[PDB]
Design a protein around this nucleic acid. Sequence first.
DNA 1: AAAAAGACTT
DNA 2: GGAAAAATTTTT
DNA 3: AAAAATTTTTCCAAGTCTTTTT
Length: 565
Amino acid sequence: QKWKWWEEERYPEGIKWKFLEHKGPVFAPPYEPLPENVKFYYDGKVMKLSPKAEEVATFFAKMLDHEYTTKEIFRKNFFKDWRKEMTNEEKNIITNLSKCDFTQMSQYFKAQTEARKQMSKEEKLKIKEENEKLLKEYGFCIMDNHKERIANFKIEPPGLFRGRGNHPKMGMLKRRIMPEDIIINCSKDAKVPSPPPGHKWKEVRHDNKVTWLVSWTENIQGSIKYIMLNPSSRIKGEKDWQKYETARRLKKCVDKIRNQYREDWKSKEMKVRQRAVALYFIDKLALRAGNEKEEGETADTVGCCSLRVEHINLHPELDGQEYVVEFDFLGKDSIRYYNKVPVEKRVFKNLQLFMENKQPEDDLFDRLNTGILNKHLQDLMEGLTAKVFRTYNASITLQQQLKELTAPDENIPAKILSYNRANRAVAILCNHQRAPPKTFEKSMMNLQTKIDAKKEQLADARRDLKSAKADAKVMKDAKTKKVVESKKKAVQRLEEQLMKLEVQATDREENKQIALGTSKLNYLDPRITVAWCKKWGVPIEKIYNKTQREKFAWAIDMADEDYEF
DNA sequence: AAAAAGACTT
DNA sequence: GGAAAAATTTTT
DNA sequence: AAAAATTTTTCCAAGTCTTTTT
Ligand SMILES: CC[C@@]1(O)C(=O)OCc2c1cc1n(c2=O)Cc2cc3ccccc3nc2-1
């Protein structure tokens, strides 16, 4: 069937749904304590760990293999959070983490993973079926006249916080989410889901100005987690489509804004000059609008509006470049951003002004935050904020590079390479880095030995063709010529294969320290891709896989070859 | 405001 | 998501 | 048959910006 929601009339502003029914959240599987033969030791002598404490102790044991279990903060926060979940006949004995021996616990769990990957196609087939009966009853909710998929219906198990970067809270206990934390949400006329026996959910909500099915407040940050619908849904995809159409609207008056923020660098007020320089950073330098965040509750990271002075060092000349601003900081997810950038005359001079009589630990743009900057953007264009730039600059770069890369001649596998090269450019601009695949970049030697082997399979068809001509000369007939054809069409089938292997080795080695994912899904207007595919006859499945085709179902169907962002 | 929350987005 | 599992599928 | 190199899931947060509260 497949419901073409994009053909429907836009859902009237404010209300998200008229009717919402769902089976609720699936809870994390109960804890199975340790057997008799898996003993825990403290101060060398055996210790009986109560169910509560035993669990918190496993979470650490299973991580013993990682290098972070040796960091101060990790161990400090851990031990503190373990103390709470301990009995007094245990809070009296265990004074420190350092005297606790998890070695045996840690060993059993590495054995479980082994004994698991050695199962029978009877057990493995049963689990893979019991896992399918859960996805049917719990993974589909009903939102207005339709059956749509839920994204992550399984509530996350309790464990230990790690987070990304050097985070202050690493090692803390993530408590087990009970029904009494869950806030259900659904329509008044919908069958309310039944809670686990002998429990009550925190609240049965009916707020129809939201898209969520369930919410709870996790304890590490005190942030609210949600169980929202699958990206393939209407509610998620109309939002997605809107986000693109909003960045597409930015396109028709982008140069207008670029005229203004240019001369704004020459205004009376520092506040307007700051706002404009920051806007330059977000525009031409694809920075995020860096909100302020609670220090000692998150990893010290930034974005443009939050950039401290210590994140830049002013250089007049370097490598033959004029007015270079050296960026050096940890962006989102503690991912470094280093950029030597030649800026215009006023901008370099404006930055010196913004850094005068200031200490390294102070802001660059004081008198600025995301709030001021975004209030301006709104006035500049109906519905514009500072993230829309990243959507424009990323999307439009794909469209441009696909134009400047794709040649009509190329066979399908080299066009895929051209597309990926386009994607790659966006990725480097949006700084979606990657740590090289776990020493496995010797898979290149194991791909080169396959290419060098094909150079033989072809080299032999070349010397086969050279001898076919040496027989076609002496005694020329329609039996020798039609063989010099079968040896020519043979050089070709191998030539097209070598291309397919070499082009695929380039694609792989260029995308070594880059990440296309976050842009593939989150930043590029899927229609830009779809058009490119319809044009050169590249079957979509070569670019977007099934969950992607499904998420992007709206683009595929509602976009021709002629489409232009 | 403008902090502190909430709901989306990356 | 992006690296790690885990389930595959390719190589040897 | 079994090492090996792949494809695909599973594990687990950190931003942006709107709406409340204070
Ligand atoms: C590296 C890619 C990226 O950081 C990002 O910048 O954009 C996409 C993305 C990320 C992370 C994430 N998600 C994402 O959609 C969804 C999601 C769910 C999670 C659920 C639990 C823990 C971490 C989680 N991280 C992401």
